[PDB]
Design a protein around this ligand. Sequence first.
Ligand code: SAM
Lengths: 238, 916
Amino acid sequence: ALDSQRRVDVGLSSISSLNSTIRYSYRWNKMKLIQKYLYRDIDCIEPLGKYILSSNNGWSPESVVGGEGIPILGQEHLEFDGVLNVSPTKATTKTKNNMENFFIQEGDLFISRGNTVDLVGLACVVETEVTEDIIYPDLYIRLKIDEKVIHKKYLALLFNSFFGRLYFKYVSKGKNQTMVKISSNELLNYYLPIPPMEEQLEIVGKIEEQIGAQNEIEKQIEEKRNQIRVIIEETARS
Amino acid sequence: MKNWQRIVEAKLEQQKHKVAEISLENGTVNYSKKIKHNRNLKALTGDEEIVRAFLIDRLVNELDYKPEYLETEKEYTIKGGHSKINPRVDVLVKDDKGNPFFFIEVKAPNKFEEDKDEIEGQLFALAQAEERDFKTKVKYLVYYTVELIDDEIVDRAIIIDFEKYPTYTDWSNGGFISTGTELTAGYGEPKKQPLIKGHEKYDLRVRIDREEIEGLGRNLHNVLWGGGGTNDSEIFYSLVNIILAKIQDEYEKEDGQEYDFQVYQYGDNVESPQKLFDRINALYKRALREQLNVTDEQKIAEDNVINRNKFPLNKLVYTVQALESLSFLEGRNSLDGKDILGDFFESIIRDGFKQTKGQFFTPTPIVKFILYALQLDKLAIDRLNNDRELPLIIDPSAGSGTFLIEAMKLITKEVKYKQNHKVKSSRQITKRFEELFMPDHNENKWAREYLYGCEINFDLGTASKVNMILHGDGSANIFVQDGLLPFRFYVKETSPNYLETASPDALYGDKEVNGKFDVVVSNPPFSVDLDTQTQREVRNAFLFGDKKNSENLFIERYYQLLKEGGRLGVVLPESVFDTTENKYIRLFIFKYFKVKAVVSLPQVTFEPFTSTKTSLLFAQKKTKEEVEQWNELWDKYGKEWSLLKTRINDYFSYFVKGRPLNKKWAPDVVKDIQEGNEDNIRKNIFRFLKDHIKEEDKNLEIKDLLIKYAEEISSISKHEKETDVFGFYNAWWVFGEVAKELDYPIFMAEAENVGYKRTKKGEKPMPNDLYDLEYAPSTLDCEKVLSSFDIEINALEASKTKLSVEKGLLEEKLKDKEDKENEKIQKRLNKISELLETIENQLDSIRSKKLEVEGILEKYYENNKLKEEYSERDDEELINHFKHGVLYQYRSEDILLRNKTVHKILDEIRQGVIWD
Ligand SMILES: C[S@@+](CC[C@H](N)C(=O)[O-])C[C@H]1O[C@@H](n2cnc3c(N)ncnc32)[C@H](O)[C@@H]1O
């Protein structure tokens, strides 16, 4: 109801509330109103700039599907569960001068810079073994955070939740609805509910169990697929 | 019924020799048996046959020519490709030597502007056949038509010498050669009647018909533009210069002498396209020595009414010939020609001008939303009622004058026609309205006093001036002297000048502010690129001229032009609203303006020329009392913050950093440190921080709080960068404190669509989301849709009754005849009967929709007035009635001001915000 309003009545006093730059605009004030509604009962709201250690933007050179070079990812590899589904399809055949930090490592936080207004700012965590070094494209940000206060996967789950979707649909600056590009400035200024680490682990556990249930559903699905295969084979053989 | 048809019928009937008969009541025409006809003409094919008969009568009776040399309805049979073609020639008159003296093609007067494409299909083939057969040359080709001026029939004709231009290339370079407007008797060379004031026949046209202007526009698009050449700036500029020259002609040539725009034609035959360049150039100097009063000798010396390299003179002579009788300054006098020329020129700008980065036009739907969202109509009505004046609108960046033109057409329409009931009927108000709007021939007469503008581009300045002359204004106030030049430089001959006046303002900083205008609407350029010749205005005249963003100077200009309480509606880029570098300007507006609406716009608004997000800002200038209150509150809270900063930084050094206490500190500081009044310690932290602290912070120890904050407390401690204007205090802290006291509500909204989508190819309609058209007029006349509509149907009923009587007489006269030979014409009479029954069938069918629309009129209208429940067009049913079927006419495309129902952003603008 609040998000689909298209009209905001803003008071003058409301402008200078955690603003520090006196920004008045429809999008910024709509985002602030939605955040005020969200964080009403929730407490312990804190900025991400205090608990951020560093942010490094990746970069990707010219490449073709295949090419027998070092592999690169795609925009479809990002997932809502917060796990980077590593399955590169394209690679770069020519070499660069420096590639030390352009590879993907385990336990990293990747942020989507440029994508559709819906799937922008999408975050993922690399949990599987990287083994071979793989290049992550320019539309990514490696985010190193303070591990003592905030857990790596909790931020990804928050960003993929509506908490981050609503913020990034108004903060994103793009020339079209197909691609909108976020930057690091709003990552510095973003406000989060940061409960004790125990609560973050509890949330992660609930998400993991409710995703394992769905995993049981698709494993039943390939059980049905194998049944189809067996029926075809037994019909053909005799 | 039309008077001219009856006049023509009477003129043809008054002739002594009864050779042709017409009957409009019966809709029949009959001709003498002397000329053989291959078909039985029984129905009126159009005005073409009447014009041909009139020309035949004029030739036979008035010009005393022998009828034996006249040939009409000549049949040709040719085999073209796989088909057969039968072209026809209208009038052939040959002399004693056999050469065609008159080769006349007859066309309907209302079909001339659209039939030109068929001319090539009717004339060149016959000439080619004649060359193939006899290898002879035709001497003169004559194209004739009639025109109605003051109930008098005048003749406008084109005479082309075939031998003079034997080839198509020579004919194209000739530019529609017309030897003379009228013919001459006694084998004389053709002569054109002078176009001179004094004689009504010689005088120009003032009753401009609505349709031929569209034909002229499409002909210019198809001929001047080459068909394959679109969006060329230089051709448009040449056309603009030609129109300006024509305007100067009516301005200066005055009465008693012929105009110099027309071909002077000292000789009987029209001369070559040359020897007119000197004429038009001297005329183009007389213009800009009379209207613009320019003082550039190099610009006068370079001439350049046209450029010879890309504007050949054949198109020039075509344009000159096309615009001989279309008096622009006097065509607006007539009600029919009131808005014809303005629409013509706005179509010229719309189709022909190429616009891109830096130079592009604001779309009309945004302009009208800006003008109506300021309640400019209500402001003008209130100004007229209270102070007997109209608002003083200025647009300091008017490129094509779109904002000014829309403001003019809005004020005139609202005050004079739409909302005329709001204005009072007092004698003083009535006389002021008399000298403003009443004469009704030039209703845009007030503009000369109340409409200003500034443009930096000379070419677009001339374009704006000519556009706004053709729309009705004198266009004296539009300046081509840059938007940001000082108020002293803006000088022009006419005495009442509200832009010259200036005076320093103590609050502004001693800088000079005008303070004379009521409304300031503009579309500020993204980058001003201010000229290096006069850079003293950057520093001395403007507060923030030294900054990198030089476009933000425009906002400061808007403070100087507006009056205390004036209105400002502008399309600012979104970067002004959300960028730290622009913060200084955002603190500026809140200091002096009362922000009232920030309407965001989609990025499809300015496509395809630019793709950047822009927003609408509506603000009102603040009076001296409010800004001095702001200044005093700013000073108070800045001093309080100044004390808090020093105190809290002294607190940090001891209580966290550990530096021993010193007696050089403030007495309250030292005693609070000594006797440990930690409650005040916490209170000062809370007050200095304001936000950035939560409920957990109050219980937690102060030392850990300070360690945790550090960065935030340092950021708050740092003062501002602009200095002088703000006064060494923190803008965020003091701004929050002052805005708590002076709170007012701001309205914000976003539009997703703007009623159009301009791809590179063309426009495609979309939902508006900004405003809704009325779609239903507030004044509908029953007698306008009833009597004239029924005249045709009852005339046809009388005609078919007479036809039925004569058919019955023929039926009897064939009943007493023998059947075997009768059968063929009896079947023909049956065909006539079935034609009559089917025609009366569609008349009955259209009478049904007549009845249903009459029922709708009775249901929705009461004494030609929309009822209060139907006043606000929320009823989609009535709207769908008007925009369907035959109710396409009499529509109202005006913007609807509902004032009680909120559906689209403009309604929330006009209801939610208050301008006072
Ligand atoms: C915004 S466009 C169209 C303005 C108006 N909406 C119209 O339709 O005519 C006006 C153009 O004139 C130019 N212009 C106007 N005033 C100017 C000034 N004072 N200094 C520099 N350029 C100016 C801008 O570059 C802009 O491209």
